Nucleic acid binder design. Sequence first.
RNA 1: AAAUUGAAGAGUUUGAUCAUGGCUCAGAUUGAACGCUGGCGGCAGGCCUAACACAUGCAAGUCGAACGGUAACAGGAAGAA
Length: 155
Amino acid sequence: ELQEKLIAVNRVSKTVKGGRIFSFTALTVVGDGNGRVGFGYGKAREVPAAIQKAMEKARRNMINVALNNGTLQHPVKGVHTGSRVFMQPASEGTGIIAGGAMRAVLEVAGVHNVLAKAYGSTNPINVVRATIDGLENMNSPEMVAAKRGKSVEEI
RNA sequence: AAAUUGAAGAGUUUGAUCAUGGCUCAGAUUGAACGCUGGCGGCAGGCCUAACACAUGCAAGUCGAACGGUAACAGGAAGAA
Ligand SMILES: [Mg+2]
Ligand SMILES: [Mg+2]
Ligand SMILES: [Mg+2]
Ligand SMILES: [Mg+2]
Ligand SMILES: [Mg+2]
């Protein structure tokens, strides 16, 4: 039932006496379709070993986001290295309109209706990093009520 | 009752990387042209250039119920046949 998505595969290279050593990298996300998302990143000489190492990482290192009927609480900004990220809770019917890197994160997360956009570097590893943290710092109508010490209508 | 209730990214500097930064692509749009091709219809559009120059026709007339009027054609008439 966990949902897992392959976001990007890439070839890097290391240089030695004999020449270049080629390897691969894999960036993935797993999610429970109901408010939990992890991302993983693995390296290996062959692609399958890399796509597999990443899922393994993605399964742990997983976090919770305070969803709201399949959509977000409030607009949110996320940032990590080059990537400035922005997300909005859209009305019902829209679905996920977003770049590939973000769509995969939001899909597996369970965010059903959102407007998203990535600014600056669309480098996938940092875009997803920035989205996860955005969702993670995203606070909930109940916690702000708890924080402020009042269960007014706003609860 | 309804009536802006909406927003995607990709390639390319490096051995590889992240950042910076330009170039390039996917989209809509057009009073278009050219190349290949071309059956019918409805609705629209059609000198963007030389406010360059223009043969010919046509594009501003109408009223005899303002007026003297008859030259055309149309009848009518004492009177010519
Ligand atoms: Mg940039
Ligand atoms: Mg090279
Ligand atoms: Mg022809
Ligand atoms: Mg016509
Ligand atoms: Mg003309």
